[PDB]
């Protein structure tokens, strides 16, 4: 259980409604506690903890530091966003939809997709099943692909068709995989 | 706090243990790249981002600042060491299992603090050094981390797998079993 | 090229 001391610095950018809202929050964290931070909306260093008070007052009295941090929302956030737009934002990975019975349970495996935005529905015949469904959270594989499993409690009978309707930004038309008894 | 997209340009981490450090850029919770501070080179995760160049001198000098900041914060806090958190381990597959075909086994090690972990894979009690890859320490809002290990394999009915995770927040080495069923 | 945010040195 050796001793260990940790220091973290997170230059964080928050974007909303595209390029409309841009906010930079540069956090200076000692162990798991953020001591001091710079927010674009406030325009200066402000201590979260007493441990950040000597850093804030010091850095705020330095004209060269403040200039650099105040222009960082455009130089780092607004700038890097332009590079994301043709790269990360433009990344589209179409999901693979598989239905596996578990039969009283039915699981819709929606795997390997990007971005994280998704909507998946269970249908009995033409009716949409909402009461008997429980969807797992959005699983992050970590290799720029997500996956989700949507389980449905069902009472099967002859002629019944169970449809899994999936909607993703990478698709202009939904993927509807069907399961028959 | 609330935005459409969140990015870290970047995740600067330095701990007294090694002494070790880490530089990464994250976009919407996924690692864009890491800088191998030893090899002095930027290793991009997504093949699209390899059209960009990140100077390793940026990361190297940023880490030289955290080295300074860490020692200063050790003095100010009066050697306030990090408390070892209890990690959360989950083992799942990237896609549904069908034995003949090729799949990837994923080991999520969430709630890591301090970021010192040993993730290893085992097949019927025997260690496997082949086809094992691991992501960098990925940042969390509560200023903790999470790491993901992978094991590329060909599922077999008799072959079972276990994820050997080692962290100071554990009394004994954690082993999460995986049954192909 | 992605632009990085810069941590400043702690006093002193």
């Amino acid at each position, epitope marked *: 259980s050796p001793e260990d001391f940790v220091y973290q610095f997170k230059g964080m950018c928050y974007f909303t409604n595209g390029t409309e809202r841009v906010r930079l929050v540069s956090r200076s964290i000692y162990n798991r506690e953020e001591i001091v931070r710079f927010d674009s909306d406030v325009g200066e260093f402000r201590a979260v903890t007493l441990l950040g008070l000597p850093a804030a007052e010091y850095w705020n009295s330095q004209k*060269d530091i403040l200039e650099r941090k105040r222009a960082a929302v*455009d*130089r780092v956030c607004r*700038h890097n966003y*332009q590079l994301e737009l043709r790269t990360t934002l433009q990344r589209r990975v179409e999901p693979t939809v598989t239905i596996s019975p578990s039969h009283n349970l039915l699981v819709c495996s929606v795997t390997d997709f990007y971005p994280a935005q998704i909507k998946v529905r269970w249908f009995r015949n033409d009716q949409e099943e909402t009461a008997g469904v429980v969807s797992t959270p959005l699983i992050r594989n970590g290799d720029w692909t997500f996956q989700i499993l949507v389980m449905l409690e069902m009472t099967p009978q002859r002629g019944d068709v169970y449809t899994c309707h999936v909607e993703h930004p990478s698709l202009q038309s939904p993927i509807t995989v069907e399961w028959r008894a | 706090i609330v935005a459409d997209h969140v990015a870290s340009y970047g995740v600067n981490l330095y701990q007294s243990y090694g002494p070790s450090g880490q530089y990464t850029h994250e976009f919407d919770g996924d690692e864009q790249f890491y800088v191998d501070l030893g090899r002095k080179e930027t290793v991009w995760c997504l093949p699209v981002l390899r059209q960009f160049r990140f100077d390793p*001198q940026f990361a*190297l*000098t940023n880490i030289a600042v955290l080295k300074h900041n860490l020692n200063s914060l050790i003095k100010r806090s009066n050697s306030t060491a990090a408390t070892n958190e209890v990690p959360e381990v989950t083992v799942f597959s990237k896609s549904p299992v069908t034995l003949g075909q090729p799949n990837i086994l994923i080991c999520l090690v969430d709630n890591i603090f301090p970021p010192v972990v040993n993730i290893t894979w085992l097949s019927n009690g025997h260690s496997v050094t082949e086809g094992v890859s691991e992501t960098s320490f990925l940042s969390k809002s509560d200023h903790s981390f999470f790491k993901i290990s992978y094991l590329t394999l060909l599922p077999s009915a008799e072959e079972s797998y276990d994820c050997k995770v080692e962290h100071w927040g554990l009394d004994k080495p954690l082993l999460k079993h995986w049954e192909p069923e | 090229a992605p632009q990085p945010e810069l941590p400043y040195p702690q006093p002193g």
Partner: T-cell receptor
Amino acid sequence: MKTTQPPSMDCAEGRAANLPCNHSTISGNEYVYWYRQIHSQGPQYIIHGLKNNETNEMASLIITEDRKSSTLILPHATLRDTAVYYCIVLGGADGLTFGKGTHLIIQP
Amino acid sequence: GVSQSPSNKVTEKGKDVELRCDPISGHTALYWYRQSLGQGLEFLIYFQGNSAPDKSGLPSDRFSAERTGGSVSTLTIQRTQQEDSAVYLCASSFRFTDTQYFGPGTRLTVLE
């Protein structure tokens, strides 16, 4: 991104000296830095800007809307303003580089 | 401002020389430059703290730089050559990549 500027300039004292600089290959995050070296001495920082037309006690800097060209304005040129003026672009980790600059001679 | 010593240095070839640079207080980044009318302003080595990350930019195995304290820096030119004759300039900024402020230089002349 590199800069080009007239090698020599002769201006009358008492009148405002406007020094041009061309930097077409500049990127959004890059700053325009102006240094001067009076002859036998180390360089001296004047001003720097990103987008806005900056002004300080020494001189003023005006960057065009397309950012491809900038100008340094010395409000009332004197014999003390006779030096070589460097226009440089910053920057990432790459580091400072001085060109031939503008050898400005203030005539009385 | 940034201090530099000595102001001038007249030496014979094959001798070793030390160039001191006292930066502005609170500035953790130091830069070393070489200025000759023939060769322009040449970037030699920089420091972020007490360690230099990139040892390139230095002309030969005779050019070394140390900044043990994490403030004042020393540039050492060993077994000097005529080609080394130049005005050695030093700059400092609070942090690496920050605005740089230059010292008065060191005029070095090496003779046969």
